[PDB]
Design a binder for these strands. Structure first.
Ligand SMILES: [Mn+2]
Ligand SMILES: [Mn+2]
Ligand code: NA
Ligand code: NA
Length: 327
DNA sequence: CATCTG
DNA sequence: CAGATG
């Protein structure tokens, strides 16, 4: 956790680069298990050969760990941190809508900067365009104080459209958190579930309302169950307009809301632990459901949930207020 | 995983 | 349709 940090860190720099610059998914994948194991490792790795001893740890890594222990640096890491190409890709990538794949093409065409991008707005698709337009706003965290206003709106409007809607803002917002990166709204409706054959309007009606009132500003992606957008709290009495925030809205069959809501609420750690305990308790849990575990190996059949309560109960556990869902 | 692009 | 992005 700090005993083999540098090592796990450099490993991660390397791993990342294989994947983002080169295409070395294998190698990439290589540095990854490596850090994963050294990460777990109980002692202070004093040398390569020692590490080597571990699984995932081969000869090349070993080598690298040595140079790093040997000197506060690694040549290769130093070579990569300079190199403009490598840099460009890590940068372009910051634009919403540009993955590495695209980052490569651009750089190879000579687009390496924000300006470059503007000048070639032609080569970008809608998502990317938006991503470019809101570069700054998108990188800005979301203060809970804005979150509440946001949540306040969405909730009111969904209500207007149909009393039967059920929305929840999951994410860290939900677990307390003073600020967040984006807004994640979970949505269901009684009339939408597991077997029920669709109802697209279910998700399209709300989106529309939100745009109606000008909360949602742009569309990144609109499907029948998932919507990726941009929203914004109405700038009061002109002098202070808000940033543009990322927002997502997803439809869920009522017969699996809570599991979803449980799940999205996280933290990752809380999940796992709960996940592991469910397992003990003779159960199964994933994004959408909880199932009684047979003995023959595994086994299914969706246990029926009406709240986050129903879940814990099942696995027989202390109902956890979202705040203390941390780890 | 669901959506988009081409 | 494969392949990209979130
Ligand atoms: Mn989130
Ligand atoms: Mn998001
Ligand atoms: Na990106
Ligand atoms: Na292939």
């Amino acid at each position: 956790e700090t005993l083999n940090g540098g090592i796990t860190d450099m490993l991660t720099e390397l791993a990342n680069f294989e994947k983002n610059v080169s295409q070395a998914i294998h190698k990439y994948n290589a540095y990854r298990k490596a850090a994963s194991v050294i990460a777990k490792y109980p002692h202070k790795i004093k040398s390569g050969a020692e590490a080597k001893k571990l699984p995932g740890v081969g000869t090349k890594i070993a080598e690298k760990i040595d140079e790093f222990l040997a000197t506060g640096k690694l040549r290769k890491l130093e070579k990569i941190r300079q190199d403009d190409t490598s840099s460009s890709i890590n940068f372009l990538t910051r634009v919403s809508g540009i993955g590495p794949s695209a980052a490569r093409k651009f750089v190879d065409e000579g687009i390496k900067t924000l300006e470059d991008l503007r000048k070639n707005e032609d080569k970008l698709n809608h998502h990317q365009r938006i991503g470019l337009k809101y570069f700054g706003d998108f990188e800005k965290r979301i203060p809970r104080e804005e979150m509440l206003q946001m949540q306040d709106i969405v909730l009111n409007e969904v209500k207007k459209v149909d009393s039967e809607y059920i929305a929840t803002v999951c994410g860290s917002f939900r677990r307390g958190a003073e600020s967040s990166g984006d807004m994640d709204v979970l949505l269901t409706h009684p009339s939408f579930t597991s077997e029920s054959t669709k109802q697209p309007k279910l998700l399209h009606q709300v989106v529309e309302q939100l745009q109606k009132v000008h909360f949602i500003t742009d569309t990144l992606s609109k499907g029948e169950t998932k919507f990726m957008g941009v929203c914004q709290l109405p700038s009061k009495n002109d002098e202070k307009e808000y940033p543009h925030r990322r927002i997502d809205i997803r439809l869920i069959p009522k017969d699996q809301y809570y599991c979803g809501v449980l799940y999205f609420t996280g933290s990752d750690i809380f999940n796992k632990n709960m996940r592991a305990h469910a397992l003990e308790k003779g159960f199964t849990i994933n994004e959408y459901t909880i199932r009684p575990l047979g003995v023959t190996g595994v086994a299914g059949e969706p246990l029926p949930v009406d709240s986050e309560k129903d879940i814990f109960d099942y696995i027989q556990w202390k109902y956890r207020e979202p705040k203390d869902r941390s780890e």
